[model samples]
Target: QPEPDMITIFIGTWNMGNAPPPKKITSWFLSKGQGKTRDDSADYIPHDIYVIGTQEDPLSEKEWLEILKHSLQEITSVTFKTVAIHTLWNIRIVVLAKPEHENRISHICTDNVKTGIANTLGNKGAVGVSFMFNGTSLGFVNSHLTSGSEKKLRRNQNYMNILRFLALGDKKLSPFNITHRFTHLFWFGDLNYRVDLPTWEAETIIQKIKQQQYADLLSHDQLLTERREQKVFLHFEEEEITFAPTYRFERLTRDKYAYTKQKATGMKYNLPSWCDRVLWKSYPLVHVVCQSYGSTSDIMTSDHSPVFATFEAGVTSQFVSKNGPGTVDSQGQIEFLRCYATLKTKSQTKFYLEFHSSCLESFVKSQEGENEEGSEGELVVKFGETLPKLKPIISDPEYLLDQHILISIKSSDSDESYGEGCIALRLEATETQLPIYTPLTHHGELTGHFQGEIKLQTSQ
Candidate 1:
C-alpha cells in the first residue's frame, strides 16, 4: 500500500528551442539505471504529481498539452488531470496530478511576468503556479533568463525582476512574500548561465565527458559560483548532476554539440553549459527527498536535452486513532463531559458538529469557557477571518469500554466531510485530560487538522 503521509512528484524542464514535439519521449519519465544499482526495482514508478516546464516551446496550448498527455501515457497507466497550465509567450509551465488527488486540491493560482527588453516583452520572463494540497501549499516557478556569454549580471537582474513582479494570487504582496507562503517550492527552466572558462576550455571539458569528469566542469559553472556567493537562488538546493551539459547541442541530433561562427574573429565557437536545471526548497518539518535526477537523451528534437527529477514529499497532516474513553455505570445515571475545540481553517466556511456512537445520549454546546470567540448556534459554527473556539457539553454520556465516541465535522455548504476522531473518555480519577487531536478528511483522504480537549465535569 502507498504511504498516506507522503506523495511522490516529478519535475521536468526543457528548452525546446522552438521545435515541435517529438514522436517518442518515454525516456523523459522512465527511471532506469538509477535504481538498477541499488535494487532490482522496475524502471518506472508512477508519480502522484507531475510538473513540466519548457522554454521556447513553439506549440500552441492545445498541441502542447496533447503531446504532453500522450508522452506521459507512453510510460505509465495512471491517469493524470491537468490541474494548472500557464504560458508566457514561448515559456510555459504545466501541472498535472493523479485523479485520486484531484478533490483534495484547492487554491490553485497562476501568474506570469516579463523581463525582456524594458520589462514589457515576453521574450524572457517567468511563469508561476501555486496550489494547496492536503493542508500544504506548493509553488512552482519556470523562468527563461537572459542569454549571453557575458550577461551573468543581466541574468541575475532578470531573476530579481521575476521575484519582484510576478504574483500568484495576492497582487498586493511581493512575490518573495508569496513564495514563502508555500511549504514546498520548485524552480526550473533555462537559467542560461554559462561556464566561466574560455571557449577553448569549455570545449575541452566536453571531451572530458568520456572520462566522467562532470564535477570538473560543474566547478566552473557560473550559476554555482553565483549561488555560492548568495547572489541568486538564496536557499534552494539541487541534486548533484551526473549528466553532461544540457545546452548548445546540435538540433535534431542526439549527442553532438553545436558550432557557431563569430563574425568578429572569424572563428568557430561552441560553449556547452548546464543551462536547464531543477532546484527545490521546503519549509521546516516538511520533507522533500530526491529519488532521481538525470537528463533524457532519447529524443533529439531540441538543442537542449530535458532534465527531470523525482521526489517524495511529505504532507502537513496525519491521523492517529486510539481506544475508548471509559465505561459508565449500569444504572440509569447521567454523566457530563466538557469539551472545547479550536480548529484552523480558511475564511468564511461553515461546519456542523456530529456525534457518532450508539451510547451517545445527548450532545450540546455549553456557554462557559469560550475563548477566541466565534458565532455559534445549534451545533453549527461559522469560521470567520480567524481561528474559532467551540465548547461542547455532553450529557448522560455512556459508552462501552471497547467502543469509541466519534466527533466528525461536515461542511454546511457542500457534501464535504472531514475526518472524525475517536474521543477516548476516562471515568477514572487519573487526572488525565483527554486530548482531541484529529486530522480532518475529505472522502477518506486527509485534508486538515482539528484539536481540542475534554474534561470530566459534574452537574451544577
Candidate 2:
C-alpha cells in the first residue's frame, strides 16, 4: 500500500434511546425495517467514522456496540469500537478503513477523566480516543458542555480543568500526552460555546494550547476572512431548505394546530447558525480545499447537524522547516511580504491619480463663467486662455509647489442688457509652499477704506 497524504474524520452528537429494548434489539440489525426505516438513508447510516453521544441506557449501549461490531465485520476491512462510554451519557468513537496508499491509522485511545471536575460539576461527557495515522498523532475529544445556566463559571472551570488534565497532566494518566507520543496532537469537539464569545471559557483553553504551540485550525483569521468573502446565498441553489425548528417546546405547540403541524412536518427540517464546530491542534493529515460547517434540515438525526471535514491526501507537503534565515521558512515569509507590498503600492497609486485629476478639473472650471454658450464663452476662455494663468500659479519660481490647490471664485453680473460679468478669485497656499502676501487698499468715503491681501503659492 502506498502512503496517503490525508485523512478525514467525521463528527456528530446524537441522543439515542436511553432505555432497554423490550424485544430483541434489531432496530440497528435490519437496515430498512421498523425504526431503522427512518434512519436507513446515508445521512443516518453509520459510516467510516462515527461519534455518537447520549447512549445512557446500558441496553442502548449494548445495542449500539453490537451494531458497531457488526458493521466492522460486515465491512471486513475497517476497525471500529466505542472508544469511551459513560453511564450518564455514552460517547463512542469509530474509525473506518482507508484504501491502499491512503494514510493508515496506526493507533487510537480514549480519555475517561471522570472523578475530579467531571464528577464535581455533575458533567456527563466523555473525551474521545486520540489516534496516530502516518507520522502524525491526533486527539479528538467529544464533549457536550453544560448549557443555559447562571453557574456558567463553574461550567467554564470544569472545562478548563479537563483541558489542563489532558494536555499537561501525567502521561501515564493523560490520554492526550500518551497519544502525542506517537503523532501530532489535535483535540476537537462540540465545545457548546459561540466562537465570538468568551462566555464558554474557551479563551483559557485556547491560550493554554497556544502556549504549547498547538495551532487552532478554525481560529485562522485568514480562513475566517475567506469564509466571509464567499457568498452563501449565491450558493443557495446547491443548498436544501426546510421549515422545521431544531429545538422544541411542547406547550407552545399545544395551543396552535397550524404551528404544531408545521413543527411536526419540519421537526427534522430547518437550518440554524452553526453552533457545533471542529477545532484542530494543527493542520490535519489531508488538504481541505472546500469545507461546510452547517447541518441538514432533512432528518431530525440530531438537534445539531453533524459537522464534517473532507480531505484530499497525497498533495505536495506545505510544511516549512524551522531553520534560521536563508532557508525555505525565511523565503516563504519574504514572498508574503512582497505580495503585500505590491498590492499596497498599486492601490495607493490608483487613488492618488483619480484624486489629482478631479482637483485639476475643478480648479480649471472654477475660473470660467457659468455659461459657455459659444467658443468665446467663459468656459471656453477659461479652458483656452485662463489655463495659462494656472501655469504661473502652479510653477512659481519663488515658492515650492504643494501637491494640492485651494481656489475660490466669485462672479458678479451687471444690470445692463448685455449682462457683462466679472469674477473675483482667492487662493490659499499650503504648507509645501509659503505664500508671499501683498495688501491693496481703496479709499472710499462712505464705506471706509477697503483692504484686501493677495498671496501667491505654487503647486508642484
Candidate 3:
C-alpha cells in the first residue's frame, strides 16, 4: 500500500530537434501498455505530479503547452494544473500537479540561463522551476547543452553556468540557491553527449540492437564517462536503463534511427546516442525510489524518443501554527521553551539545532583583498531543562511579515545537517495558541517533527 505522505512523480525528457508536435501522445503519460507484449490485466497508475521537458522545441510556448495539457487530460481522470513553466528559447520545462494539491503547493518561481555564443544567446541554454510541495522544496532544470560529439568540456561548463545563474528569488533578498537549498533536484533534457566511437562502427553496432550489441556500446557513452571522472553530475543518480538509446531516431518512423546529414557541417551518418536523459539527487540520507524508467516508442514524430521515469517520494507530513499574544512592529526579544524533536530515523542519535533569520544583510562594499561577505545573526539553541538564550535580533514585523526563522538539525558526532525547518514569525503565530509544530525536512523528505513554545516581545 502507498503511504499517505508519499507522492508519485512522472518526469519525461525529449529532444524534438525542431520537429513539429505529434497529434496525440497519450501513451507517453501512462505506464500500463509500454512493453512489447502488453498485458490487458495491468492497470494504470496515476502520478501526483508531472514534469515535462523538451529540447530544440519547434512550436511557440503557448502552442506547446496546450498540446501537452491536452495529451495529459486524455490519459487520466485526475485534473492537473500547471504549477510553473519556463523557457530559454528552444529549451523548455513544464510542471503540473493534481488539483487536490493546489493548497499544498507554494513558492512557484521560474528562471532561465543562456550558455550559447558567449553566454548571450538562447540557442543553447536551460530553463528551471523551483517550488515547495507541502514542506519539501523541489527544483527541476531542463537544458539543451552545446551539440557536438567532441564538446564534452563545453557541456560540463554549461552545467556549471546553469547552477550559478539560475537564481529563483530576488537577487538582494533570499536567493534560493539551486543545488544546495532545494531538497530534491531534477536535471534533464538533451545534453547532446554522444557515443565515443567512430561513426561507422557506432552505426554498424546500433543496427544490431536485436542481438543486444548496443549493450556493449553503452560502455563508450560520453555522459557515462564524464560521470565516472566526476566531471559533471557528480552525486546525481540515474536508474538502470533497460531501453534503447533515445536520440537520432528517424523522423516520422515508428522504429528506426536517423541516417541523415548534420546541417552545421554537412557531416553524414549521425550516430545514435542517449542524448535525452533524466537524473536526480537528494540530500544525504533521503530515500527516493525510482519505480520505472524507460523510453516510449508509441509516438515517432520527432528525431528522439521520449524518456520517462517515475519515482515514489516523500513530502511534509505536518505543519502546526500557533497565535502569538499580540502583534509587535519593532525590535524585540525572543524565547524558545520546551524545544524538542521527534525524528523518524536515528531517533537515538544525539543532535543539536541552529537558528538563523531568512532575511540577510551583506556588505555594500569591501577592499579588494577582503572577503566582502557579511554575517547574518544566529540564535543559540541549547538543550536541557535550562532555557537557552534567545538573543534577540531586529524584528521589523513589517519586514519579516513574509519571512521565516530557519532551523537546522545537526548531528553532534559529525556535525552534519540532518534535517531543517522554517518557523514563520508574524504570519503564522499568535499569543493565544499552543506550541508551534514545525515540519522538519531532509533533502525535501520529511524526516522529523519540531515543536516548541515561542515567546516574543516587541517595542511599543
Measured over all alpha carbons after superposition, the RMSD of each candidate to the real structure, in angstroms, is: 13.3, 25.9, 11.2
lDDT of each: 0.65, 0.30, 0.66
* lDDT tens digits, residue span 1-460, model 3: 2224678888888888688867877666764223232233423545788999998788887898788777777666556798988877778899998887787788888999889574536488889888877657778889888877778889988887887678763333222236555557888989888877887675575665545456677788888889888778766798766677777777787467775566743685567777888889765434588876777777787888887877877664323223221232235555666666656663344566666542333211111111111133212233423334343333444333333555666666666656666665553443333365666655444566677777654332
Model 2, 410: alpha-carbon shift in Å? 75
Write down the worst ten-residue block by lDDT for model 3.
Answer: 363-372
lDDT of 3 at 244: 75
Instruction: For each candidate, give its TM-score against the true structure.
Output: 0.66, 0.39, 0.68
Encode model 1's per-residue lDDT on 359-409: one tens digit a residue. 333332222223344354212133222222222222222222212344555
Winner by TM-score? 3
**What overall lDDT, based on C-alpha atoms, would model 2 receive against the true structure?**
0.30
Answer with 1 or 2, whichever has the higher TM-score. 1
Least accurate 10 contiguous residues by lDDT in model 2: 333-342
Top-down lDDT ranking: 3, 1, 2
Which residues of candidate 1, in runs, are more than 4 Å off? 1-3, 31-44, 119-122, 169-176, 262-270, 318-460
